Design a protein around this ligand. Structure first.
Ligand code: NA
Length: 182
């Protein structure tokens, strides 16, 4: 079942509220007053160049960033072309990337929220219709709608009462989520 780690900054926020804010910040640094854009590490595949156990990316408009973990692949020109597929175990969201393939993998300088044990596995046959593609390609432009829908489904699988409108603290009571320092 889904496991969620969250900075205590977000304890009283709902999952939907948090994803909306991260996505808005991905589109515009000004969404979070006080932040400046000064990240140099923009991510990529680890090990890469186009497959890895991680795919990390930083926004161009802000230092909002994410890291997808699992066993991931990008088809390039191979049919079905421009497809991101494979096993997606985790999505971590936050601000600024550090590391890389030769430095212990990618990490977030400030990890805000992580969603793990996602259990997503999209075969190459589905192409750009696969859920892994929709989730990770969406996040590449800061769009968290596909991710959100998968989190909602996974929460409802734990208990009918849980959803993306639950707070992180409510999800912690349910046994799904765990707080981290800010
Ligand atoms: Na910054």
């Amino acid at each position: 079942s889904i496991s969620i780690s969250y900075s205590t900054t977000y304890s009283g926020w709902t999952v939907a509220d948090y994803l909306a804010d991260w996505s808005a910040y991905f589109g515009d640094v000004n969404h979070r007053p006080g932040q400046v854009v000064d990240g140099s590490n923009t991510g990529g595949f680890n090990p890469g160049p186009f497959d890895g156990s991680q795919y990390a990316l930083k926004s161009t408009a802000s230092d909002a960033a994410f890291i997808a973990g699992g066993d991931l692949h990008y088809t390039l020109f191979s049919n079905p072309s421009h497809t991101l597929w494979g096993k997606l175990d985790s999505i971590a969201l936050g601000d600024t990337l550090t590391g890389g393939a030769s430095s212990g993998g990618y990490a977030l300088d400030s990890q805000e929220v992580s969603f793990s044990n996602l259990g997503l596995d999209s075969p190459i046959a589905q192409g750009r219709d696969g859920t892994v593609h929709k989730v990770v390609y969406g996040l590449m432009s800061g769009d968290s709608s596909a991710l959100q829908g998968q989190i909602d489904a996974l929460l409802k699988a734990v208990d009918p009462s849980l959803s993306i409108n639950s707070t992180f603290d409510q999800l912690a009571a349910a046994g799904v989520a765990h707080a981290t320092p800010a």
